[PDB]
Amino acid sequence: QGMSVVTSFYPMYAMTKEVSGDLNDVRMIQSGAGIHSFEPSVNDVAAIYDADLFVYHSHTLEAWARDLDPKSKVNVFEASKPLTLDRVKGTLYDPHTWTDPVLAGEEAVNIAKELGHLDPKHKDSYTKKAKAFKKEAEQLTEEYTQKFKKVRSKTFVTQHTAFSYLAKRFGLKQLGISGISPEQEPSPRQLKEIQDFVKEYNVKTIFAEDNVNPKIAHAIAKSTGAKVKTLSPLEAAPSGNKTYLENLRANLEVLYQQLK
């Protein structure tokens, strides 16, 4: 009862699920680490072909989604079609929009439309709930755009380049030890450039993430006089049952408390 929905990783599962409510059956492909270097198993693609809707974030992330041509009434929906992804500096694009409350809220809205478009009978519950999500997202944005405006230290160093949009929306500066993907690891040379960055901007916290070994994270910490903490890009299903925004909110707090 209700259409089968399938999502790529955590931010998609959370959004479509909170928007659908109890209506459909939402499932997720990759709930762990590696969405960047992930490739679906034959089983994964099968669940996609037996599902009424399969929502994934982008072609710049789930590259494997582009190569799916069904005989099944399954809809492939690239939820971040509207958004305008920034180019990667240093051409490819930074897919990390979901860590930005606004862009996240407006992508959740886009899913509500696709949900409503396939099931007009309940198009209200979809749009009704998407109003809430988007709403809670503005409230969180206002709350933190305010808290960060009171903070002097504006720079933070994360495991990889995953917080460019979040840093952007709150007037912060972020530097990743690794690139857009956790696989794009730094050479000894770049390790030096990062340590010099931490010293120059006087960063006192290097934010490791669960999805990757903090060995290097800790090394830089020891050498630049900083402590290691955890800042999650929400790419892996968080422990506990919080809302997408409450999880995001949680991290907005550690960042905030740290820069303070």
The distance of closest approach from Cβ of residue 233 to Zn ion in the complex, given in angstroms and rounded to an integer, is 5
The distance of closest approach from Cβ of residue 65 to Zn ion in the complex, given in angstroms and rounded to an integer, is 16
Stretch that binds Zn ion, among 5-13, 157-165, 197-205, 209-217 (CB under 5 A): 157-165
The distance of closest approach from Cβ of residue 159 to Zn ion in the complex, given in angstroms and rounded to an integer, is 9
Q: Which is nearer to Zn ion, 151 or 254 (CB)?
A: 254
Q: Is 235 annotated as a binding residue?
A: yes
83 near Zn ion, rule: CB under 5 A: no
Stretch that binds Zn ion, among 11-19, 113-121, 139-147, 160-168 (CB under 5 A): 160-168
CA angle 29, 32, 37 (to 5 degrees): 80
The distance of closest approach from Cβ of residue 35 to Zn ion in the complex, given in angstroms and rounded to an integer, is 7
> Which has the closest alpha carbon to 33: 167, 133, 162?
162
Region of residue 164 (phi > 0: left; psi between -120 and 50: alpha; otherwise: beta): alpha
What is the total count of residues that contact Zn ion (CB under 5 A)? 1
CB 202 within 8 A of CB 132: no
The distance of closest approach from Cβ of residue 36 to Zn ion in the complex, given in angstroms and rounded to an integer, is 5
Please count the other Cβ atoms lying within 10 Å of the Cβ belonging to residue 157: 25
CB 40 within 8 A of CB 29: yes
Bridge partners, residue 205, by sequence: 227
Stretch that binds Zn ion, among 74-82, 115-123, 159-167, 221-229 (CB under 5 A): 159-167
> Which has the closest alpha carbon to 52: 126, 106, 110, 117?
117
162 near Zn ion, rule: CB under 5 A: yes
Provide the token pair at 58: 């982008």
Provide the token pair at 21: 């409510």
Q: Is 96 annotated as a binding residue?
A: yes
* 230 phi/psi in degrees, rounded to 5: -115, 130
Identify residues 177-236 at the interface with Zn ion (CB under 5 A): none
List interacting residues with Zn ion (CB under 5 A): 162
Please report, in range form, the residues annotated as the binding site for Zn(2+).
36, 96, 160, 235
